[PDB]
């Protein structure tokens with residue numbers, strides 16, 4: 001517990017130094033805000049374009065010419081601007097769905113990752129997932145995924161099975177390992193060796209079929225308990 | 229079979245609209261930022277295409293490679309593992325795929341940019357992902373890969389689906405043959421029918437489709453006296469030819485926005501399909517999926533990614 | 545200083561036979577980075593660092609210790 005505390009607490013501290021000097025990690029958000037103001041800008045600049053008409057000021061076409069001509073010109077303004085909207089609008093719709101597609105992805109992470117624990121792999125980020133802490137951000141959300149990553153490994157001789165009397169013994173959970181002499185059954189994602197007894201192992205089949213079974217003696221809880 | 233990326237294209241707006249004519253080129257300036265915002269649009273596509281291929285294929289920190297000698301307990305992966313004797317190392321299956329799928333548009337401006345990742349690189353990822361899946365189980369997605377006996381991997385992947393591991397080690401030899409004989413038919417499933425890859429084949433066609441259409445739009449009058457931009461300049465004095473070239477420009481310039489909008493919409497589909505792959509690649513290949521019929525009909529054991537042109541193929 | 549690529553004609557970056565992580569993506573695997581005096585270079589991107597798992601039918605590696613990482617998403 002203690003060792004996990006500091007690993008958690010410190011790993012938090014790294015986050016605040018990351019974002020402190022990191023402009024890029026928000027690139028996803030910063031891009032979205034940009035691209036809108038971008039197309040918003042471009043939408044505005046299109047008010048300065050001739051579009052083939054003699055000027056981009058609406059009234060300055062009027063007061064220059066007698067209106068029966070302006071009716072012609074103002075087309076090339078309207079035909080231009082009206083288009084430039086439908087460009088901008090059709091953009092937004094597409095871009096909206098893109099966000100809409102990322103909203104589902106968020107609303108699913110919020111549902112599954114935060115409010116649950118996600119059995120899905122690498123949906124909540126690398127490593128096995130423990131919990132997530134959402135954090136608001138402008139026009140977005142930021143999850144802090146707390147994930148369990150193994151670290152130090154040790155090469156182990158293993159066997160899928162262990163003969164005892166000719167019965168086969170398989171682990172309920174985990175695998176038979178040994179450091180080269182004493183066969184230990186241990187849980188998979190952490191090294192926690194335990195002596196092999198019936199409570200660790202269940203019997204199935206016999207010693208012929210398994211490929212890789214190794215001789216050993218599976219200690220019995222009960223046998224000593226008798227001897228008195 | 230899933231699409232992942234689509235052909236990255238970038239169109240030169242000023243040239244495509246106005247070929248080799250300053251006369252037309254000057255007029256285009258009066259429509260302002262259309263020319264530029266199209267490049268800004270297509271680049272957004274073209275960029276994320278190499279982001280798609282990035283998300284899907286490279287989720288793995290290191291490039292693993294299979295051990296020199298293959299003993300998996302009877303499972304024969306020579307089908308799916310990289311072929312050491314090909315110059316571009318690609319598993320025997322992947323060649324079946326690259327055969328099925330297949331300056332014309334460059335003459336105008338439609339330049340087909342190279343995908344950031346060469347196919348040979350894609351085949352190294354899908355080697356890694358497949359090398360770690362075989363040796364290291366699912367742990368390589370969660371951290372440093374952990375060598376585990378493959379036959380002791382499949383004892384877990386049965387516990388995943390609720391079949392107690394004592395089934396495997398007793399049935400191992402049988403399960404070996406069923407696996408191998410299943411892999412074999414995957415060859416002919418691909419080898420003897422060309423419609424399995426339609427999903428990919430449809431993507432490639434539709435891209436080359438619209439390009440053809442986009443090109444053929446150059447030859448349309450659009451109400452102008454001719455589709456050759458110079459003929460309007462040759463026959464007519466400019467003052468009238470201005471109005472003519474509008475109908476070309478207005479026509480063509482519109483005809484780009486049609487094409488561009490299609491690509492945006494179509495890419496947004498691929499963008500959705502890419503995530504589906506990246507989801508499978510992460511959950512199905514790298515882990516074991518508990519989601520019923522997400523990895524394909526039946527209880528899922530493991531998945532083998534295989535590259536295909538502008539796409540990816542999983543063997544579940 | 546000119547170099548011919550898969551993606552086109554590159555100018556002003558010294559080719560490097562060494563291969564490093566892709567840094568500035570160019571095309572067809574060519575990826576450029578600034579470092580060595582210094583000059584922009586161009587090189588075939590190494591996808592990943594290389595590893596070969598040490599594998600044998602009795603060989604298993606079980607982690608003895610762990611970390612708890614917090615990855616912003």
Ligand SMILES: *[C@@H]1O[C@H](CO)[C@@H](O[C@@H]2O[C@H](CO)[C@@H](O)[C@H](O)[C@H]2NC(C)=O)[C@H](O)[C@H]1NC(C)=O
Pocket residue numbers: 003006007152608609610
């Ligand atoms: C597991 O790893 C942690 C480090 O991540 C070890 O904790 C460190 O232990 C050393 C003693 O060797 C102390 O000096 C450090 O202060 C500890 N770090 C923290 C963050 O508390 C821990 O000992 C390891 N445990 C095992 C069983 O390997």
Ligand SMILES: *[C@@H]1O[C@H](CO)[C@@H](O[C@@H]2O[C@H](CO)[C@@H](O)[C@H](O)[C@H]2NC(C)=O)[C@H](O)[C@H]1NC(C)=O
Pocket residue numbers: 179180181182
């Ligand atoms: C493998 O691990 C076992 C479990 O600890 C070791 O067995 C113990 O080894 C210590 C050596 O300091 C002895 O003091 C104990 O009496 C041993 N206990 C038993 C039940 O055997 C074994 O030595 C280890 N072997 C290797 C090669 O690492």
Ligand SMILES: *[C@@H]1O[C@H](CO)[C@@H](O[C@@H]2O[C@H](CO)[C@@H](O)[C@H](O)[C@H]2NC(C)=O)[C@H](O)[C@H]1NC(C)=O
Pocket residue numbers: 213214215
């Ligand atoms: C496991 O132990 C058994 C005996 O406990 C071994 O069986 C022997 O196998 C040899 C090989 O032909 C026979 O000649 C002997 O007669 C067998 N023993 C008996 C008592 O019949 C078996 O070989 C061992 N296997 C492993 C992998 O350790």
Ligand SMILES: *[C@@H]1O[C@H](CO)[C@@H](O[C@@H]2O[C@H](CO)[C@@H](O)[C@H](O)[C@H]2NC(C)=O)[C@H](O)[C@H]1NC(C)=O
Pocket residue numbers: 298302303304305306307
């Ligand atoms: C895996 O299967 C391949 C073919 O699917 C085997 O390669 C064949 O090996 C035999 C040797 O008995 C040759 O006669 C064939 O010509 C080979 N075919 C090909 C296509 O190479 C390979 O031996 C098998 N390996 C394992 C370990 O099962």
Ligand SMILES: *[C@@H]1O[C@H](CO)[C@@H](O)[C@H](O)[C@H]1NC(C)=O
Pocket residue numbers: 153154155598
């Ligand atoms: C396990 O054996 C391999 C053999 O090459 C070695 O490289 C590796 O370092 C060993 N594991 C540990 C934890 O040292």
Ligand SMILES: *[C@@H]1O[C@H](CO)[C@@H](O)[C@H](O)[C@H]1NC(C)=O
Pocket residue numbers: 211212213299600601602
């Ligand atoms: C494991 O592989 C070795 C080859 O290095 C072989 O001698 C041994 O019999 C194999 N054992 C099993 C259970 O497959």
Ligand SMILES: *[C@@H]1O[C@H](CO)[C@@H](O)[C@H](O)[C@H]1NC(C)=O
Pocket residue numbers: 558559560561
């Ligand atoms: C790479 O090595 C080859 C010889 O194998 C040499 O011809 C070439 O000039 C080298 N490249 C650079 C950038 O020095």
